[PDB]
Structure formats: C-alpha cells, structure tokens
Design a protein around this ligand. Structure first.
Ligand SMILES: *[C@@H]1O[C@H](CO)[C@@H](O[C@@H]2O[C@H](CO)[C@@H](O[C@@H]3O[C@H](CO)[C@@H](O)[C@H](O[C@@H]4O[C@H](CO)[C@@H](O)[C@H](O)[C@@H]4O)[C@@H]3O)[C@H](O)[C@H]2NC(C)=O)[C@H](O)[C@H]1NC(C)=O
Ligand SMILES: *[C@@H]1O[C@H](CO)[C@@H](O)[C@H](O[C@@H]2O[C@H](CO)[C@@H](O)[C@H](O)[C@H]2NC(C)=O)[C@H]1NC(C)=O
Ligand SMILES: *[C@@H]1O[C@H](CO)[C@@H](O[C@@H]2O[C@H](CO)[C@@H](O)[C@H](O)[C@H]2NC(C)=O)[C@H](O)[C@H]1NC(C)=O
Ligand SMILES: *[C@@H]1O[C@H](CO)[C@@H](O[C@@H]2O[C@H](CO)[C@@H](O)[C@H](O)[C@H]2NC(C)=O)[C@H](O)[C@H]1NC(C)=O
Lengths: 235, 110, 105, 214, 225
C-alpha cells in the first residue's frame, strides 16, 4: 500500500508504541486523572522550587553530559544534547520548540524524507539542537516505545554559580543570573519555571500539569515575533 | 432510517468538524429512548488507535481518513437493544470533557 | 466496573434553588462534567472540570465535587432551566455516564 | 539570517541546450531547498523540493542536486516556454528567505533596429506640453542606446524609455524613447533627432525632423 | 486541489489602511500554515508573516513593524491580512501562500496577487494625441502610427486599434509614471505605406474608473502633408 495522497502527518511520524507492561500510557491519551489520583506528587517531591536553589556569580558557561534516567516532569533538567535517533524507539509526534512548536518528521539517513510510517531499518529522526538565532530549534520531547517521556535540547545551560544542588538551568532562570532566557539558556518546552509551551500533546507528555491555566504571551527571537500560548499555574 | 434487518451492519458518519480537527479527539455516544447516555468508543486522528467499549469490545470497528470526514464505526449484528440515537462529540486532546456535541442520528431495528 | 448514582427526579418552584447530586465511590478524585439535554436535543456541556463552565453559560449555573459526591446547584430556576442533567466521569480506561435527573418547574 | 546567493544574475542560451543555475546558502541548510519558476505577471510556481525532489506534473527536464552549502538546478533541453525567472528558497529557519532570481532568455541571430520619429501634433501643442516619440522596432539583442539631440545638443534627465517584453514568435524586442518639453521650451529650437547605437548597426543611426513644417 | 482566490486591486492614500482577503476555493485552511508574500515591481519575493490555526500561533516578520495583522475565519474559510499606515513604498502585488506545518515544507500553492497602489491622486481621464507620420518616413516603404495616451490615473488603460481589428504589428508599451504622478503610454502600429490611403487608423482608449472612452484618428500625412 502507498503512504497516502500525500497526507503529510499520518505518515512521517514514528507510530511504534508497545506496552506489554500495562502502564496504561496509551489509555491516558483520552482522559487524565486529577493531580492526586495520577500519583504525581511523590514524583514531584524530588525536585524543589526555584526559590532557594542558589545564587549565580560572574559570567555564563555551557555544560553537557548530564542526564539522570527518569521522566522529565520538572522545571529543571539537563536534557543531554540531542542527536539522530532511530524510528523504532519513538512513539507519537516530535514537537520541537522554536519556541513556536514545530513537528519534525522522519528523515532518511541524511536529508531524504520518508513516508513508511517510521517503520523501516533506515527510517530515522534527524533532530539536532542548535539555537534558532543560528537556525534550527532549542529542543524537544517525545515518548519512547514503551511509554516513557524523553527530552533532549541544546546544551543544558548552566548558571554561573555553585551550591550543594546547583541548577543546570534548562530555561529562564531569572532573578539568579539576569541573562538566562529562552534564547541563550532555553532547552525544552518550559518557557518559564512555571509553564510550558502549550501544544496539543502537552498534557500527554506531562500528565500532571492538568490544573494549569492557559495564557497568551509573545516574544521576539532572531528576527521574528512569536505569538504563543503558555499554560501557567499559580505563577 | 428504515429497519436494518436483524443481523446487519450500520455506519455512523460523524461528519466530525469541530475546533482544530486533527488535534481533537472524536468520540461516539449511544442514547436509548429515555434511558440516558452510554459510551461506545473513541478515536484519535494522529495516533491511529481506536479504544473500544467493554460491552461493545467486539462489534465496534473504527475506520477513518485524513480529511475532515469519513470517520465512523461499523456496528454489526443489530438487535432490538441497539435501537437508539447516536451522537458524535469532539473533545480536546486529554481534558476528558466532550464539548460540541453534534446533531444526533436515529437508528431503529425490527 | 464503576457506577455513578443520581436522584431520579427533582421538583422546584420558580425563582428558587435546585440541587442535583451525583454520588459514587471516591468520586472526589475523578473529574466530573455536567451535561444538559433539553427534550429532543443534542446535549450541551454546562460544566467541565467539576466547577468550571464554558462560555455562553449564565453565571447562575454552579457545581462542585468533593468527598464522594458532586452537586449541581442552580439558583433562580425558570421555565428555561427544565431539562435532563447527566454526570460524567472517566474511570480505568472507561467512560461512565450517570443517571439522568429530570428537572421540572 | 540565512542569506542566499543565486548565480548567474541573467543568462542567455539557444533552444535545445542545457542550462545550469547555481544557488548557495550562507550556512549549511542540510537538504531543505526548493526551486520556484515565475513567468512575467504570474504567481510563482514550485519546481523542485527537498533540493533534489521533482514535484508532480513538472517536466522531467528539470533536475536538482546538492547539499550543505551548494545547490544546483539544471534544464537539460531548454524549451521555448522555459523562459522565466528562477528563485531558490531555503526552509531551514523559521524566517523564510528567497534567492535573488535569475532571468533566462533565448538566443538567435542579431537583427538591425528600425528607427522612427514622430512630431508633436497640433492638439497637444497648445496645451503647454509637447511630446516627441522615437520608436525602435523589432531588434535584437536587447542592449541598445538611444540619445535625443535638439539642435545638435545632448539632453539629460528629460526623456523616459519603455521596452516591451521579448516577442514569443520572433524573439525580438522594441523600445520607445519619449521626450517631453513644455511649449516655452519647444518654441526655442528648430532641429530634433534621435540617435540609436546598437550591435547590429555598423555606425550609429540618426533620424531627424525639422521643427514646425506646419 | 486548492485554488486560492484573492480580491481585486486596491488604490489607497498615504496613512490609510488596507485589508486583503484570500479564500481557499475547493479547500480548507486548517491543518496548514498560511503565509503572505509580497513582490514589489522589479524586485524579488518577500515574506510578510504566517499563521498556524491548530497551534494557534502567529509569526510576523519584523521587517513590517507591527503593521501586518493576519486572521482566519473558518466559518467563512477566509484569510485576512490587514496593513495599516500605507506609505508610498507599499505599492506592490500581495500573494497568499499555503504550506504544511511539518518542519521545512515548500509553498505548494499561491494566490494570483492583489495589486496595491498607494498614491495621492484622483481618478482622471486620459488624453489622446495622434502620432502622425512624416512624409519622408512614409516614403520609406514602411510607416507607423500611434496615439499617445497621456495624463491618466489609475491603471490600466487598454488601447485597441479599429476596435481590435489590427493586432499584428501593434506594440503597446507598459505604462510609465510621470514625475507629476500621472501615467502615460503609447500603442504604436506599423503597416504598409500603400494602405495608408485607407482609413482604419483610429485608436480606442478605454478607462473604467474615469468612465472615459476616446476614439482619436491619426491622420496619414497629417499637417500640411
Ligand atoms: C548534530 O550534532 C551532533 C554533534 O555532536 C552530531 O550528531 C551526532 O553526534 C554524535 C555524538 O553526539 C555522533 O555519533 C556518531 O554516530 C555515527 C553513527 O551513528 C558514527 O559515524 C560516529 O562514530 C564515531 O566517530 C567516528 C566515525 O564517524 C569513529 O572514529 C569513532 O570511533 C566513533 O565510532 C559517531 O559515534 C555524530 O557526531 C553524530 N551522529 C550522527 C548519526 O549524525 C552531528 O555533528 C550533527 N548532525 C549532523 C547530521 O552532522
Ligand atoms: C488532593 O488535592 C488537594 C491538593 O491541594 C488536596 O485535596 C489534597 O491534599 C492532601 O490531602 C491529604 C489528605 O488525603 C493530606 O495529607 C494533605 O492535606 C495533602 N497531602 C499532600 C498534598 O500530599 C490532595 N490529596 C488527597 C489525597 O486528597
Ligand atoms: C512490544 O514489542 C514486542 C513486539 O512483538 C513485544 O514482545 C516483546 O518484545 C521485547 C522487545 O524488547 C522483548 O524483550 C520481549 O521478550 C518480547 N516479549 C515476549 C517475547 O514475550 C512486546 O509486547 C512489547 N515489548 C516491549 C519491550 O515494548
Ligand atoms: C526499507 O528501506 C530499504 C532501503 O531504503 C529497502 O531495502 C532495499 O531497498 C533497495 C532499493 O530500493 C532494494 O534492494 C529493495 O527495495 C530493498 N531490498 C531488500 C529489503 O532486501 C526496504 O525495501 C524498505 N522496506 C523495508 C520493509 O525494509
């Protein structure tokens, strides 16, 4: 059978999701439990609020090689700068943040688009973090085959500073170093320490942000102006 | 619609056009005359996955196309208990509530 | 399985308040939405996320959910608020529709 | 910004040859390039996608290749209707950019120009304005110089020229140089002429008409 | 097989505003990205802005400093672009291009283009003058006649000789904007000298906005002879 009459979204995506371990992550694509029933709060317990992290000093640097195997459901993280990935280890689309969301598709090997539903030996997602001021995106997230969230973006921005739990800033760590922003230090969907870029599959990737409230924000990157929706809570 | 002779098939064309289309979960609901609603299944245009109702785990069969229509079911083996009005709704991705219920469709069987 | 319970019918006088209860097992942790269906019409969403309401719905409509019960409170009833109301919840990859409570003024 | 450069600015070739058009991006853009063709007074049309893919319905004589910071498009057998402007566009950054455009032409034997001069009519004369038109008919190549001389004196910044598009059946051009002078300036001189210099002429031509003769 | 259809040409004044629509005939704007591309005469294409419905996102090129505002109406299925403070340099053809929402897609559809003319002038009628031939020129075996259409506004003016009877050997040049902000163009015709005795040498200048229609006769061997 052919791919489609073009249909450049049903093809060009990695539809290889298996859950023999009944975690029920494809079931929660329709509904979502409360912040309590989903059992996030103990998951959220291990990362602390932005208030008491540390104080940044002097200039700014860059760092990579971080990344503790977990689910990135927190405002801080070090997404371990991205690279090419096969199409057999990805479930669902791959939204990469310009910050304006962009859906990346399967690119065969070097630069060849493919339309085999992402199931072939060579079908591969060629996503490479690079600051949009020099083209490309900041970073992006997707769910691996078995049903775990994964993320990867530009070299996770450190904030010049130290502590017992120094922050490997992935986004807009303001009031610590007044240079962090989603143009120099931003990696993933998290525009600000308390809300992500709103895209259709935001809740699925982060299933315990249900109590977040929509909001309209705008910012200029490179030579373009972006009108975007950010879903923030509390603030 | 006329009587679909016992042991037939029926298609429910949802003519589903609501909100932002692709990123909007389709669904289906069946209401018997004066008996309240009951679920039948769901569907997602991007992830070609068709969740099934436990009571209708066998007969419900979802097939659709990329366009704003052609999304429907195929409920076979009609029986008197299947006489009802079917409504198509289009909710957001994972909020749960089914906003913008569509016009109903009556189905009868002898 | 899961079961949601609501009173069969309610009767009130004009301008007064009417309360409809949808009760279930540990329903305080399941999001509940309220539908209103007039005679021979496709339902319409009047409340979602228990308390929140969509645009185009009067502020008179109110709802809440806690413990094991969810209430739909309407203040100042009139002949234009006579219709069945249904309570909806999601449980264990299944959709549950509570019983219909006929409101008559 | 990903500035793009297209070369050559304008090229001319006969019918049945092969023409190569080079585009280059300021920085590596992987395989995100597209080639558009726009005929005069028409919306641009997409020709090549992915820097090497051929769209549906496009004639097979267009081929694309390249990667990184080097892309090329080629027409193997140039046709009469392949005369247009060609643009290269990069879709690698959110700020779309286009190439500088390249103009294609058709070659043929040089043709000598025919010069005509028209005196101003009486109706326009008494309205305070006088227009003298010198016409060049069915010449080739396009490059041609026209100068207006009134009483063997060269004029500057007082005439405007208009060139028709290349003839589709003769592949020859035409030109009209118009000189506008008020009545007060028109009644002071006696000699008018237009001088044309072109490749197909051994020596410059000059057409003159005496003022008045009425 | 979408066919984007735009509105007719607009003529405005400095400091005014314009709103151009783009309707997708036989198609739908949802599930796509819509961009506006302008082409100034004698210049390359330029990118105005973009709107993505499903993402609810809008990107406006900072070249147009906030004057561009795009919107979409699904009920009518139309794409509106509003430009305010129309300066003189805004005169151009505006196209609507449709793209996919996946990274790096090509503009596979365009609109015909809507000419925008920003100039301070009032609709004026044309003036027709005859370009009668010189006798010595007529003696040369081939002669030409014309009628110079002068000082009209706005475009376009169509010239037809003998109600279009003569088409071969007619070279109607493109219009030229005179320094006084008024148009001017010529439509010359060349025919054998022998026929010049015949009388089929009246041009038909037609202008719609001015509701003008002039038939001027170019006299062979005019003036004394
Ligand atoms: C995107 O940015 C990246 C910059 O680091 C890079 O993308 C990949 O980066 C990883 C490291 O982060 C590299 O992985 C290579 O994997 C391929 C096979 O998948 C190998 O060719 C290569 O092998 C290593 O290098 C030598 C052979 O090339 C060999 O001598 C070594 O012993 C070792 O085997 C790497 O392991 C690689 O840089 C990038 N991988 C791929 C698949 O692109 C790219 O620079 C950039 N993207 C592109 C398209 O350039
Ligand atoms: C449920 O959601 C809200 C959180 O704002 C609140 O109703 C509950 O807070 C928890 O309630 C616990 C009682 O079951 C009690 O330990 C404490 O108040 C609080 N504990 C937390 C948040 O860890 C949330 N939980 C429950 C179980 O209702
Ligand atoms: C999905 O993948 C396969 C598809 O058939 C299923 O079978 C298991 O595949 C994993 C692959 O890592 C093996 O390790 C298991 O041993 C397979 N199960 C067997 C042989 O019983 C399985 O349903 C899913 N597995 C995973 C990992 O998602
Ligand atoms: C997956 O892609 C590969 C190559 O991209 C296909 O493998 C071969 O492709 C070459 C060139 O077309 C031909 O020899 C055959 O088409 C393929 N030979 C094989 C598979 O032995 C392959 O067909 C594609 N599909 C799958 C399911 O692997």
């Amino acid at each position: 059978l052919i791919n489609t009459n073009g249909s450049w979204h049903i093809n060009r995506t990695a539809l290889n999701c298996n859950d023999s371990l009944h975690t029920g992550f494809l079931a929660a694509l329709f509904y979502t439990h409360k912040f309590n029933a989903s059992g996030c709060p103990e998951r959220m317990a291990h990362c602390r609020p932005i208030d008491e992290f540390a104080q940044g000093w002097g200039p700014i640097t860059y760092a990579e090689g971080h990344g503790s195997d977990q689910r990135p459901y927190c405002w801080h993280y070090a997404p371990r700068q991205c690279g090419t990935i096969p199409a057999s280890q990805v479930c669902g689309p791959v939204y990469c943040f310009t910050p304006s969301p962009v859906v990346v598709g399967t690119t065969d090997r070097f630069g060849a688009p493919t339309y085999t539903w992402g199931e072939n030996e060579t079908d591969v997602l060629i996503l490479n973090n690079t600051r949009p001021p020099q083209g490309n995106w900041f970073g992006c997230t997707w769910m691996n085959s078995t049903g775990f969230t994964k993320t990867c973006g530009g070299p996770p921005c450190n904030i010049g500073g130290v502590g017992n739990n120094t922050l490997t800033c992935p986004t807009d760590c303001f009031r610590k170093h007044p240079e962090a922003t989603y143009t120099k230090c931003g990696s993933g969907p998290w525009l600000t320490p308390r809300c992500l870029v709103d895209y259709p599959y935001r809740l699925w990737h982060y299933p315990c942000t249900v109590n977040f409230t929509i909001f309209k924000v705008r910012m200029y990157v490179g030579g373009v102006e972006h009108r975007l929706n950010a879903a923030c809570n509390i603030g | 619609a006329e009587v679909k002779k016992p042991g037939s098939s029926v298609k429910v064309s949802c003519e589903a056009s609501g909100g932002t289309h692709s990123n909007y979960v389709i669904t289906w609901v069946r209401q018997a005359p004066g008996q309240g609603l009951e679920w039948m299944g769901g569907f997602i245009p991007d992830f070609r996955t068709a969740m099934y109702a436990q009571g209708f785990q066998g007969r419900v069969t979802i097939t659709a196309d990329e366009s704003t229509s052609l999304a429907y079911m195929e409920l076979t083996n009609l029986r008197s208990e299947d006489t009802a009005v079917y409504y198509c709704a289009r909710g957001p991705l994972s909020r749960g509530y089914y906003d913008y219920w569509g016009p109903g469709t009556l189905v009868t069987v002898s | 399985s899961y079961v949601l319970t609501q009173p069969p019918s309610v009767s009130v006088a004009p301008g007064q308040t009417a309360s409809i209860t949808c009760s279930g097992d540990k329903l305080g942790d399941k999001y509940v939405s309220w539908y209103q269906q007039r005679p021979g019409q496709s339902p319409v969403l009047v409340l979602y996320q228990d308390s929140k309401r969509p645009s185009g719905i009067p502020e008179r409509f109110s709802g809440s959910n806690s413990g094991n019960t969810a209430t739909l409170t309407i203040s100042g009833t009139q002949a234009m608020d006579e219709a069945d109301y249904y309570c909806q919840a999601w449980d264990s990859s299944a959709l549950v529709f509570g019983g219909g409570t006929k409101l008559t003024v | 910004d990903v500035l793009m450069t297209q070369s050559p600015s304008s090229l001319s070739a006969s019918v049945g040859d092969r023409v190569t058009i080079s585009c280059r991006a300021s920085q590596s853009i992987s395989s995100f390039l597209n080639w558009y063709q726009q005929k005069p007074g028409k919306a641009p049309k997409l020709l090549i996608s992915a820097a090497s893919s051929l769209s549906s319905g496009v004639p097979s004589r267009f081929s694309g290749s390249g990667s990184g910071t080097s892309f090329t498009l080629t027409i193997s057998s140039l046709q009469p209707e392949d005369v247009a402007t060609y643009y290269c566009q990069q879709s690698y950054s959110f700020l779309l950019t286009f190439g500088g455009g390249t103009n294609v032409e058709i070659k043929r034997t040089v043709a000598a120009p025919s010069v005509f001069i028209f005196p101003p009519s009486d109706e326009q004369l008494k309205s305070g304005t006088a227009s003298v038109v010198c016409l060049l008919n069915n010449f080739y190549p396009r490059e041609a110089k026209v100068q207006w001389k009134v009483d063997n004196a060269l004029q500057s910044g007082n005439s405007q020229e208009s060139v028709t598009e290349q003839d589709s059946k003769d592949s020859t051009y035409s030109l009209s140089s118009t000189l506008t002078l008020s009545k007060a300036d028109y009644e002071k001189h006696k000699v008018y002429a237009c001088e044309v210099t072109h490749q197909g002429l051994s020596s410059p031509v000059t057409k003159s008409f005496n003022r008045g003769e009425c």
